[PDB]
Nucleic acid binder design. Structure first.
Lengths: 51, 63, 66, 64
DNA sequence: GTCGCGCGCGATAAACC
DNA sequence: ACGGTTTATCGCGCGCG
């Protein structure tokens, strides 16, 4: 159900949603493989939505 | 996405609730099994296919 | 397969309650995780251990479901 | 850290513009692949190595 | 502080045809 | 004088502190 809820960093999403950062990056890279999201370069990386 | 369509069309053509293996796909489509499993497990990560754990695994159209 | 006996003897120790991961076994036994896992997967197939799917997967002593 | 010196030594003795995999380096040099990759990725960060995209990744001397 | 990692994978045993 | 080839969860990309 975590995927249904979800630029910003997974660092920010972890504190905003109260979820371990490991689980946030897991759903981001999954939906990024699903194409719905796109990752921008940064440290930590930036995450935006693809239209 | 071209290889993804040959796999999805066959599974869709091959019955409405039937599954098949990567080996069967390898033969029917004339493609090394490595390329088939590369696409199959990718479609499973995308949610396009449902994987039945087995030896070999069985692949069916996903929700 | 000399390590697989040390894997079980470490697993059978403190084995009434919880389980452990392969990364923990890699450090506990001073063995590269490449050998720990391929011993574990061979151990789970032999019926001496049971694999609990996870991230990372957890490994314990096999529990009879007879 | 003489592991970096022998990796570049192997890729140098391989040929001009020749590339190989991390799994091939692990066996020819007798070193765990876990150690090989952490150096190959580091040598690319220093700019001394270039990584061809693929599966597995192909490693060659940088033509930067 | 990037990190998502689940990985065992063959220096293969076994199975196949 | 002689079983070659493919499977196995085999999909692996992994380097991770």
């Amino acid at each position: 159900h975590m995927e249904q809820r979800i630029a910003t960093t997974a660092h920010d999403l972890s504190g905003k949603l109260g979820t371990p950062k490991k689980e946030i990056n897991r759903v981001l890279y999954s939906l990024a493989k699903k194409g719905k999201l796109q990752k921008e370069a940064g440290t930590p990386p930036l995450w935006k939505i693809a239209v």
